[PDB]
């Protein structure tokens, strides 16, 4: 089979992980989706010329069993760490985020993104100079997106996976 990418997108909820998803996958902005709803996407692309397969679970929180995140977290070979760039919080959270997928993961090397949603708003409460300063600290790209409009969509999955290739090459 073609090659196979585990994508986790992860974050504080209300950040636009459902949205930033479905932009990526049908390329349709989709407003309202129940926040409480956690599922796996698929998406046949081409990148650097590689034909293959997307495969993104959409996180969506606490889970029935704290054995199921660990496992997601184990299964996954990327994670997409997204903030939205007008909640200070959810800036905040990447810090458990980023510790808790390593510690699952029992890995000081875990590909990731570090993205700054929702920035077709004007009403911002983190500047990209604070979100680079993060990125530089964990050693990662960080991008800035918008579900809304597309602007930065397929370039956060795009360099995950890019992340990944640089992972599997050692
Ligand atoms: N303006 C704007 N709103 C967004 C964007 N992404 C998501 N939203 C809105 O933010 C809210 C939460 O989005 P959702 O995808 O449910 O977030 P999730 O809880 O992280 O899955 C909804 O009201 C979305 O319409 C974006 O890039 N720009
Ligand atoms: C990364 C990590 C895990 C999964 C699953 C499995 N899964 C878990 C919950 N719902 C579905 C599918 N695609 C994935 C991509
Ligand atoms: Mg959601």
């Given at each position: 089979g073609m090659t196979e990418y585990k994508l986790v997108v992860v974050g504080?909820?209300?950040?636009?992980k459902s949205a930033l998803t479905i932009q990526l996958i049908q390329?349709?902005?989709?407003?309202?989706?129940?926040?409480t709803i956690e599922d796996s996407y698929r998406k046949q692309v081409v990148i650097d010329g590689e034909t293959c397969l997307l495969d993104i679970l959409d996180t969506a929180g606490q889970?029935?069993?704290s054995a199921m995140r660990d496992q997601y977290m184990r299964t996954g070979?990327?994670?997409?760490?997204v903030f939205a760039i007008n909640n200070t919080k959810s800036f905040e959270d990447i810090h458990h985020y980023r510790e808790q997928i390593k510690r699952v993961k029992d890995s000081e090397d875990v590909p990731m993104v570090l993205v700054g949603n929702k920035?077709?708003?004007?009403?911002?409460?983190?500047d990209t100079k604070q979100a680079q300063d993060l990125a530089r600290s964990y050693g990662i790209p960080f991008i800035e997106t918008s579900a809304?409009?597309?602007?930065?969509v397929d370039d956060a999955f795009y360099t995950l996976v890019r992340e990944i290739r640089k992972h599997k090459e050692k």
């Open positions: 504080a909820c209300g950040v636009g390329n349709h902005f989709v407003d309202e989706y129940d926040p889970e029935e069993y070979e990327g994670f997409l760490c920035c077709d708003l004007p009403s911002r409460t983190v809304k409009t597309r602007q930065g």
